[PDB]
Each structure stands twice: as C-alpha cells, then as structure tokens.
Structure 1
Amino acid sequence: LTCVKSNSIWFPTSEDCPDGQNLCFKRWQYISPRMYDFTRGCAATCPKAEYRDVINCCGTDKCNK
C-alpha cells in the first residue's frame, strides 16, 4: 500500500507503507479555536474520530489525499 504522507517532518509526499500497515489516514488535531495539526500517513488500525482528534482511513493507494 502507498499513502500520502505529511507531518512535522515531511512536506507532502508518498510513503510505501511498512508491512502490516494497510490503511492510509488523514488526521486533524485541535490546538486552539483557529489552529490544528493536519497529518497524513500509513496506519495499522483506525481509532474512532473525536471532535478534537478527527481521523479517517481508507485502504486503497493514496486514498488519503
């Protein structure tokens, strides 16, 4: 599986997922009313979304743009 990857170290790019990580995720973490951290990458499992920790996942190549 290949996913879009973007985080504190990576400008948007693509990652070939480590074996056993078969999900691509998009995640938003609340910092303040007008600020959040947006990240993208590979994952093994998808936790439930919450208001301040919003996540969605998918299992097709680069489906997490």
Structure 2
Amino acid sequence: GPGSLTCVKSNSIWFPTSEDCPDGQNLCFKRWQYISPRMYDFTRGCAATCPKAEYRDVINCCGTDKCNK
C-alpha cells in the first residue's frame, strides 16, 4: 500500500496472522525452506530483502498488501 504495507505472517502450521511491516521492509515473502527430501519449513512474513534461496528452496516475493497469502 501507499506508505503502509501489511504482510501475511506465518511461522507455524496454524491459522496465519497479519504483520504491519516496519520501515525499511517493503516486501512480503512466502518461503519454503528445504531440510530433508519431503520436508519444507513454510514461513510467511515481511522482509527488507528476499531471503537467500538455498538448494531446493522456493521463495516468492512481492510488494502488495497481503500478496504472500
């Protein structure tokens, strides 16, 4: 949004919440982190830069209100 930016917030397997981005973080990320073959740790939130995508990671970035749903 213009000035303000709210991302979906998720660090667990339960219902997601919403986070108001602090100044300097203008992106919403949706991040699947690889640990073991069928294991992907799923996180959603706000960030200043997109996290580094390692081997077998899938990361989606965007700058719209709640675009990482």
Query: TM (normalized to structure 1)?
Result: 0.83
Shift in alpha-carbon separation, 1:9–1:33, aligned structure 2, 3 A = closer
Query: Larger % of strand: which?
Result: 1
User: How many Å apart are 1:51 and its aligned residue?
Assistant: 3.7
Counterparts in 2 of 1:16-55, with a 5 A limit?
Answer: 16-47=20-51, 49-55=53-59
Q: CA deviation at 1:56?
A: 1.5
Matched, 1:10 2:14: yes
TM-score, normalised to structure 2, is 0.79
Poorly superposed stretches of 4+, deviation over 6 Å = none
The unaligned stretches of length 5 or more in structure 2 are none
Residues 12 and 42, structure 2, Cα contact 8 Å, conserved in 1: no
Q: CA RMSD in A?
A: 2.0
Cα distance, 1:9–1:21 mapped onto 2, change above 3 Å = farther
Q: Judging changes above 3 Å, is the alpha-carbon distance between structure 1 residues 24 and 11 closer, same or farther for their aligned structure 2 residues?
A: same
